[PDB]
Symmetry: C11
Subunit: 69 residues, 11 copies
């Protein structure tokens, strides 16, 4: 299954997993401090990921940067 | 399944999931504020995605921008 | 399954689903206003899509533009 | 899933015709397009060949081709 | 399955379906007039396709042109 | 399944299908006259194809040309 | 046949953390790398996201990324 | 399944099919005269192909010529 | 399944297999002397590989070098 | 499965098939004379192939040449 | 499965198969003299291959060369 790379460019970046299925809510929030890298798959439980905070993001479609709050 | 990357370029962008199946209605609207990124798949429940508001969007077919 | 990206270049664009199966009819018309984007799959229920109105469209085969009357 | 064709009508009354899959061949559906309208259509359980009549711009996995009307 | 694109470059082009199976014969002859485009798959019933008449043909292997007479 | 494109460069080109299975014999010869095009698959019944006569041939491995005597 | 990440520690004490697959998300394992060591780790039935903490050079299918201490 | 293209550059080229399985023998030899093309798959019955005689051959790996 | 190529650039390189499953520990350490090459898959038993010592490594993602 | 192309550059080249399974022995040696070409698959019975003698070899990984004793 | 090409650049090269499974031991050592080429798969019985001696090696990842003691 696909995965997303997220590198925190500041402290407190929040990588939020949203529930697969008929209902949509977050099920997990993973906090990243500056410089930490999370490599996360889509899964049986996670069908959408949201990033809040300043982060450098790689996906199969190229690079994208989130900008915090 | 494929996924779409949506970066909100203003506050209040809405990423709306349309229901898979014989009926078509909005089942969920994810609101993004300026700068937030959402990476969303097509799924058993979502067969079409609508973006309303200013956003930078990446799919397998390239980049496209919605305008509010 | 494949998908189409449609960006409305004017108000009142219609993205119309045609029914899969021995019967062919419109089962849904999604109305888009200027600047809105719709990313739509082929599915069990939809085996052809028709765009009416001015829109920028991306498929696996590249870009194409529909023009309104 | 299956391949699809993009058809952009370059004049009014373009006619996209779906031919029956199976041992017999006849049209089962005719979808008329006005100028500027786009139809994106798959091959399916019911449609194993597609004919285009009228002036249109067509994209497939093999590239671009243009039909020209009678 | 794969498919062939055939554009008739004169009237009365024949796109002919040969039967899949232990026996080989024509099961259908589609007649195309000048300018008409046919996009045709290999199928359960059709394992070979013959083009007679002047036509521009695209397959996965590139372009080829039939010539009538 | 793969397919071969064959364009007859003279009259009476023969595209011959050889039987899939423990035995190897000709099961069908398709005659092409100059300018006709045959697009033929490998199948449940056909596991090798022989061309005799002058013809332009395209496969996944590129172009080749048969020559008659 | 899953995807994998390559992690080369650029300083002592780098942590490569596996997060559990499923409805529950927690760290299940932390592999400590010292400077110069390389770990090549797959996504698995038990690991659906990987966090890197500490200075490291990382390779995925999406290209290179660096974690910062 | 993959296939090989063989164009005979002289008369009497032999394309030979070797048996798949625990045993290896020739089950079929197809004779090609000059200019004839044979496009042949690997199969349930044929797991190796031998070309004897001068021929132009194309595979997924490129061109090669027998002598 | 993917595989890694490891060429020992000094004696005593260790290519270590980590156990697939809920639990994680090293189950094997293959020792390589200078100039030897090991080509190793991921497998039912091995879901992560650690290289310790100076080595030239090739994967589907390109080259990387471990250092002593 | 994949296959290897072997062209003998001298007489008496040997293409040897090693047995798939817990045991490893030669089960078949195909002798090639100069100029002959053998296109051989990996199979249920053959999991490794050894070439002895001067030959030009093509695989999916490129060209290699074996050199006679 | 993937395979490795090994060309011995000196006499006495050893291509060693390591056992697939919870235990890891050498099950077979194929000895190659100078110029011989071995093309070997990963298999049900072999999940890791070791090359000892001077040899030119091709894999899907490119060329690598082993150097003898
Ligand atoms: N629960 C929703 C989550 C989701 C995925 N993609 C989306 C796109 C838009 C809105 C919601 C979603 C689903 O699995 O379908
Ligand atoms: N319920 C529809 C939603 C949809 C997907 N793609 C479409 C294209 C046009 C109209 C509606 C749709 C379906 O699953 O088929
Ligand atoms: N109901 C038709 C719809 C359709 C798909 N592609 C077409 C092409 C031409 C005409 C109709 C169609 C079917 O599923 O086959
Ligand atoms: N009924 C025919 C339609 C068709 C598909 N491709 C063709 C090519 C030639 C002629 C007819 C066909 C079939 O399903 O086989
Ligand atoms: N009935 C034959 C038709 C055919 C397909 N490919 C061919 C090549 C040569 C001759 C005939 C054929 C078959 O299905 O096998
Ligand atoms: N009956 C043979 C036909 C064949 C296919 N490829 C070949 C190569 C050589 C000789 C014969 C063949 C088979 O199905 O296996
Ligand atoms: N337990 C979560 C772990 C996870 C994977 N990707 C994520 C993205 C965001 C948050 C959590 C996750 C799951 O398997 O789905
Ligand atoms: N009967 C042998 C034929 C064979 C295929 N590839 C080979 C390579 C070497 C020697 C023999 C073979 C097999 O199916 O395995
Ligand atoms: N036992 C773990 C080993 C592992 C694989 N990838 C990892 C990433 C991080 C930590 C541990 C691992 C597993 O199979 O899931
Ligand atoms: N019988 C061994 C043959 C083999 C394949 N690849 C190898 C690599 C090294 C040594 C032996 C082999 C196997 O099937 O596993
Ligand atoms: N018996 C081990 C062999 C192995 C494959 N890859 C490895 C990497 C490291 C150590 C051992 C291995 C296995 O099948 O898993
Ligand atoms: N010999 C090893 C690995 C092993 C072999 N057979 C096993 C069966 C089950 C668990 C582990 C093993 C050990 O005892 O750990």
């Amino acid at each position: 299954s696909d995965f997303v790379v997220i590198k925190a460019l500041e402290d407190g970046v929040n990588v939020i997993g949203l529930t697969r299925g008929a209902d949509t809510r977050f099920h997990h929030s993973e906090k990243l401090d500056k410089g930490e890298v999370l490599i996360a798959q889509f899964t049986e439980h996670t069908s959408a990921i949201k990033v809040r905070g300043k982060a450098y993001i790689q996906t199969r479609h190229g690079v994208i940067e989130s900008e915090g709050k």
